[PDB]
Amino acid sequence: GTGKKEKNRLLREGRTPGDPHVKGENFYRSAKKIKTLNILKEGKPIRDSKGKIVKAASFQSKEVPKAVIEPNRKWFTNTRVISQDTLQSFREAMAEKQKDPYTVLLKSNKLPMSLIRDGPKLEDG
Amino acid sequence: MFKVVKTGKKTHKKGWKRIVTKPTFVGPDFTRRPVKYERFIRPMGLRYKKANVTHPTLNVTVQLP
Amino acid sequence: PRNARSKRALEKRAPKIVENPKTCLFLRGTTCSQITQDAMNDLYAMRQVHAKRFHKKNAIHPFEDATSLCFFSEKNDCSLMVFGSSNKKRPHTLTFVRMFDYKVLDMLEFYLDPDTYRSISQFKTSKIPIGMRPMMVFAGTAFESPVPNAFTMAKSMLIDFFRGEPSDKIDVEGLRFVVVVTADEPQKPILRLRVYGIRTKRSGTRLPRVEVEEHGPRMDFRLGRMREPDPAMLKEAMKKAKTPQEERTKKNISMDLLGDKIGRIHMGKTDLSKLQTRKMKGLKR
Amino acid sequence: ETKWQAFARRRGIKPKTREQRRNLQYNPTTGQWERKWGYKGANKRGETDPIIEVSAAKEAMRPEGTSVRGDKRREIRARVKKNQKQMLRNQRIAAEK
Amino acid sequence: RQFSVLHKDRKQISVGLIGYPNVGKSSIINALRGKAVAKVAPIPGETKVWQYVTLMKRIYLIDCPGIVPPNQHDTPEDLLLRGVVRVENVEHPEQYIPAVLRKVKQHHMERTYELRGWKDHIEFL
RNA sequence: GUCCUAAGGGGGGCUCAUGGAGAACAGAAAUCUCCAGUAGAACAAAAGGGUAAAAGUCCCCUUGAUUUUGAUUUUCAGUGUGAAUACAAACCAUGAAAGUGUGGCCUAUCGAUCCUUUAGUCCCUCGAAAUUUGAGGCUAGAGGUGCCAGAAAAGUUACCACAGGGAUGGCUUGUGGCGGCCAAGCGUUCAUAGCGACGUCGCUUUGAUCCUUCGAUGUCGGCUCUUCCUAUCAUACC
RNA sequence: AUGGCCAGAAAGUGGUGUUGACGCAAUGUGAUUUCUGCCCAGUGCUCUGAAUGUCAAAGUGAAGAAAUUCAACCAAGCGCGGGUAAACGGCGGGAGUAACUAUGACUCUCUGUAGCCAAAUGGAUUA
RNA sequence: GACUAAUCGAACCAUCUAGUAGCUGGUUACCGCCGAAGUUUCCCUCAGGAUAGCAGUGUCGACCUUCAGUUUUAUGAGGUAA
Numbered sequence A: 001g002t003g004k005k006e007k008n009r010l011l012r013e014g015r016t017p018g019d020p021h022v023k024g025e026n027f028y029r030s031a032k033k034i035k036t037l038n039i040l041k042e043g044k045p046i047r048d049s050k051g052k053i054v055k056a057a058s059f060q061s062k063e064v065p066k067a068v069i070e071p072n073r074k075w076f077t078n079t080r081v082i083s084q085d086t087l088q089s090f091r092e093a094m095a096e097k098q099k100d101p102y103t104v105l106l107k108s109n110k111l112p113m114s115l116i117r118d119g120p121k122l123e124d125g
Numbered sequence B: 001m002f003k004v005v006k007t008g009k010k011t012h013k014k015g016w017k018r019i020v021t022k023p024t025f026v027g028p029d030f031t032r033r034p035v036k037y038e039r040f041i042r043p044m045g046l047r048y049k050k051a052n053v054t055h056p057t058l059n060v061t062v063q064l065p
Numbered sequence C: 001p002r003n004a005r006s007k008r009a010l011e012k013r014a015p016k017i018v019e020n021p022k023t024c025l026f027l028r029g030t031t032c033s034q035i036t037q038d039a040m041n042d043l044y045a046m047r048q049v050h051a052k053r054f055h056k057k058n059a060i061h062p063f064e065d066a067t068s069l070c071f072f073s074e075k076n077d078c079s080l081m082v083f084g085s086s087n088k089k090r091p092h093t094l095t096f097v098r099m100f101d102y103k104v105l106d107m108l109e110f111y112l113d114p115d116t117y118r119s120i121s122q123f124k125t126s127k128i129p130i131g132m133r134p135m136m137v138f139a140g141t142a143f144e145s146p147v148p149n150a151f152t153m154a155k156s157m158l159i160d161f162f163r164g165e166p167s168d169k170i171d172v173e174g175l176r177f178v179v180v181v182t183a184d185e186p187q188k189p190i191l192r193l194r195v196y197g198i199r200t201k202r203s204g205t206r207l208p209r210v211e212v213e214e215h216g217p218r219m220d221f222r223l224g225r226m227r228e229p230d231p232a233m234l235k236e237a238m239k240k241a242k243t244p245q246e247e248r249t250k251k252n253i254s255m256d257l258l259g260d261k262i263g264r265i266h267m268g269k270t271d272l273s274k275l276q277t278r279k280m281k282g283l284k285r
Numbered sequence D: 001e002t003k004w005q006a007f008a009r010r011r012g013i014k015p016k017t018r019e020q021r022r023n024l025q026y027n028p029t030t031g032q033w034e035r036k037w038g039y040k041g042a043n044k045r046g047e048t049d050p051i052i053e054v055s056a057a058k059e060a061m062r063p064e065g066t067s068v069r070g071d072k073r074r075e076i077r078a079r080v081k082k083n084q085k086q087m088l089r090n091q092r093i094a095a096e097k
Numbered sequence E: 001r002q003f004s005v006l007h008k009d010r011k012q013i014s015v016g017l018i019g020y021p022n023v024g025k026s027s028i029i030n031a032l033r034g035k036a037v038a039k040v041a042p043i044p045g046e047t048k049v050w051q052y053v054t055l056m057k058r059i060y061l062i063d064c065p066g067i068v069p070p071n072q073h074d075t076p077e078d079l080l081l082r083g084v085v086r087v088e089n090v091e092h093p094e095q096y097i098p099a100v101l102r103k104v105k106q107h108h109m110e111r112t113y114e115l116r117g118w119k120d121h122i123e124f125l
Numbered sequence F: 001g002u003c004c005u006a007a008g009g010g011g012g013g014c015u016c017a018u019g020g021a022g023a024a025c026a027g028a029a030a031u032c033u034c035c036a037g038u039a040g041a042a043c044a045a046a047a048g049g050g051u052a053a054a055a056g057u058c059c060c061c062u063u064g065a066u067u068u069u070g071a072u073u074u075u076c077a078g079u080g081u082g083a084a085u086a087c088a089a090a091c092c093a094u095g096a097a098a099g100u101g102u103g104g105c106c107u108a109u110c111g112a113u114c115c116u117u118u119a120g121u122c123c124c125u126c127g128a129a130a131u132u133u134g135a136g137g138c139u140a141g142a143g144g145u146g147c148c149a150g151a152a153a154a155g156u157u158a159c160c161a162c163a164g165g166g167a168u169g170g171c172u173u174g175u176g177g178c179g180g181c182c183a184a185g186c187g188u189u190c191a192u193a194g195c196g197a198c199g200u201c202g203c204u205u206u207g208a209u210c211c212u213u214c215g216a217u218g219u220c221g222g223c224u225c226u227u228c229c230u231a232u233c234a235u236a237c238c
Numbered sequence G: 001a002u003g004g005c006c007a008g009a010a011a012g013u014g015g016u017g018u019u020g021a022c023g024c025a026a027u028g029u030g031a032u033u034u035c036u037g038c039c040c041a042g043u044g045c046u047c048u049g050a051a052u053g054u055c056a057a058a059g060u061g062a063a064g065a066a067a068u069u070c071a072a073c074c075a076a077g078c079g080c081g082g083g084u085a086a087a088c089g090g091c092g093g094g095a096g097u098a099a100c101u102a103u104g105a106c107u108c109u110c111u112g113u114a115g116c117c118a119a120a121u122g123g124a125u126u127a
Numbered sequence H: 001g002a003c004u005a006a007u008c009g010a011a012c013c014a015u016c017u018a019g020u021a022g023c024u025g026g027u028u029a030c031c032g033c034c035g036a037a038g039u040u041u042c043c044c045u046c047a048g049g050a051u052a053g054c055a056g057u058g059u060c061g062a063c064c065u066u067c068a069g070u071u072u073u074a075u076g077a078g079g080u081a082a
């Protein structure tokens, strides 16, 4: 055939020449698979001969960041708005909402449910 | 922020899992990742959904989701 | 496009999923008669918002060469054209041109009857407001041909001429003017273009009684020379783009009345006839 | 697809988020918010500052007439020229296709 | 598999099995896998910790220990008859025999033990 | 080598190049006034009909340097409150208004002491001599990763082994956080600001419900036995 | 059986072999009882199928004065095109309609207080 | 991964062989005269380098010029108190 080398495999698969590769990639391993399996091996810091950490482990960087918030006009506006017609339509939708055992909920709609759900009963109130 | 979670039965433990030590908000329809692929652990005891929000002009504090 | 205004112009001229309303260019040849000029003036009065008008003489014969038409369409972003001509063989001719991607898609000639032609100013009536879209009626048996011919083509291009701006809603005050095109299958048939104003009267029922009165212009045409589209270019022209605001249908996926995404499961019929229960010692006689 | 888009698709390079690609950064030393590029950007830091400390070897290798205040503009223009040449190559390939 | 298709956007789906002890959760997992992957025993509390079993490439099964929701109307006799506890570690097991004799028809007991003619539970035992 | 509250957007006012006639210096060419001026100027593109109370040029307002929402489009996602993207809506700017307009453009990277390539006539050498090919050296040119070549040497060891190096504190205790108000007082009294104990006010079931227990990286025990502390359960006194 | 599995530096070398499919060799599973979710066709298995598409050495042809250069030709394998141990894998179905056939795309729809059936039993709750 | 002469994830014996180690341990009389130092500047870092600076012995040159971690004067910065 052509050869079982990695270069021959790349030439057979028609990869772009000069593209960088992650260490450990082979016929059985893709880049994302190599990253996923290297996640399991992550977590050990880099130390010198005397045991002092010279490079910290992943997500243990010990460096204190600058926690600042920029001035922005987006902070003083309304993120979500709803109209009265849409509110009334949602109230009607909750009114003839019915239950069905063979239908499952996959993603809830982010709605102001306090303005849509019917109020409590008179005796409870 | 993160603490190292040790896993394994040997004396030498694997340390890839990180647990969040601060309160977190996970959002609606939250299903946790399985343990084999859960790197960041957000515990159920530190999850909050509501906050006491004060309106500066009206001087009213209301618990809001 | 260094300038922001030129960038805006190129972005407006760029192809879109939801296209802009079509622009019509009104132009005439080197020799164009006064009746043909009046007919183009009436059509421009009907469609003045989305039309541009040329005022010079163009030495163009569209059925021989249309490179100048393609150049004008590219320069003016016009996808419909009304071209006026006059000749000994063809005394008063309106050349309706529809184009696709700055190339000529199809063309059709109309021969106008000079004796029965009445302009809009010849009727002392209240006229259509500027920019208002008229209603359309196409009548006769000439437009129901199973094979695409001159009359079906004329119906399609008159529809594109009188479309205006598409809209999801309309006020009931925008139903006051109607354009009626009548033609019959048969020596050559006459395509009659009329405009009427609509008035409503009491009839004692819920539905109003409609009465019409002529608005102008009065045009009589004989359908002339032809240029049909190529099948491939016609296919690309009649391809319909899909709006992002319409959801691709997925099986067992829906949205309920509250906006929640709902999935449907199918249990199937329960068949316990193939189940053998345990032969316990207490159940054996 | 351009050369970068093909390379990113092959290498799994996700596009940057809109909060990440903002033209805004916090300068700690001045304690002020400044832009990464553009008018008065961080890429042209010190072009209008009163005191610039230079290296003796740097003006030794510097040609006559040029000053230290234009080196950042020179390097920015070089990067702009390289990016523009790559963009023109991509446009030529797309027009060929 | 229908649930997996409904959640095809995820990498997989997880199915956790819950119920009382000794209802058949580990047995259901083993039956669905076709292989004895979870420990099964008639004694309650065989499953003490949660266990992952990879059923398919996109389906995981989670075995859980048997739970008993507390209720003031539930008696130790009711819990024992539902199968919460082991009968070896209970005191005076003969007091629960009348509950069994009420729950089971008499002829079923007679055909099970080939014995008849008792008046009460102590005589039967 | 310099200069700029950036470009852009909206609204308003004005008309440009040029020619003629005039005005101390000023004389072809400086500034000013009038007339005539289809744009022959300027701005964008490459009209065979771009723009004149404007698309030109000056003023006013914004300059907030890339907003929010989406069960929708496309792609991706072992970090799935989804991200990027398209579309739509809302918001925003401006104007009296009709309206108008924005909420980016791009790109793998590495060498330049590098890579590829050309010429040498009157350049030198191929060492027994010469000629013709060829080859090396030296010199002088050309282009710049589309046509300038290239840039794929992984793990595991709980079967193990060797050479070494290691193994916060006169802290803590009984009384929450955030935000507002009052406030003796401290200050201030050419500014009347700023701190402030004591408090107070908002958020965090008619004796109910029991059908909402919310994640081990950090590990304790048991026996025997002695002593100490008081932050006292019991016995003594009050 | 001028065969398989091996061994040897080689050998006119040795073993299986004083052997021949009810045998030898290599595997997986592991008494008996129970037992083979449905469905293929992506990786892989193999194909007495077409191609020269990739294509070494030797050989062939042309140019030059020759070194040399350029062309075809090029076995096995690969590739292309077929049938599967369908092992791994992947896998909601059921009807259609129409694009013609290659990719389909679209529309509709799914919810017996101890019996019946099987060659006494209906079992792994296995002595 | 068991056994193969108390030796087994490759037995024992002799040799190459005084193999290699940047790692560990150690490194032998007296007196006298001087006598220290930690980003200064450049380079892809850690499993990195040079290099400035500080020192001792000898000399040689007219050991010639004098210089100085100091003050004052003139003038900057600080016009800041007053």
Ligand SMILES: Nc1nc2c(ncn2[C@@H]2O[C@H](COP(=O)(O)OP(=O)(O)OP(=O)(O)O)[C@@H](O)[C@H]2O)c(=O)[nH]1
Pocket: C278, E020, E021, E022, E023, E024, E025, E026, E027, E028, E039, E040, E041, E042, E043, E044, E045, E046, E047, E064, E065, E066, G125
């Ligand atoms: N007859 C019959 N018995 C069953 C069935 N399923 C389970 N069993 C029996 O019930 C017992 C319970 O089995 P488990 O798998 O341990 O069920 P569980 O609820 O998980 O028990 P825990 O481990 O305590 O939680 C088993 O010993 C089986 O013998 C069944 O379908 N039919």
Ligand SMILES: [Mg+2]
Pocket: E021, E022, E040, E041, E042, E043, E044, E045, E046, E047
């Ligand atoms: Mg059990």
Ligand SMILES: [Mg+2]
Pocket: E025, E026, E027, E039, E040, E046, E047
């Ligand atoms: Mg169990």
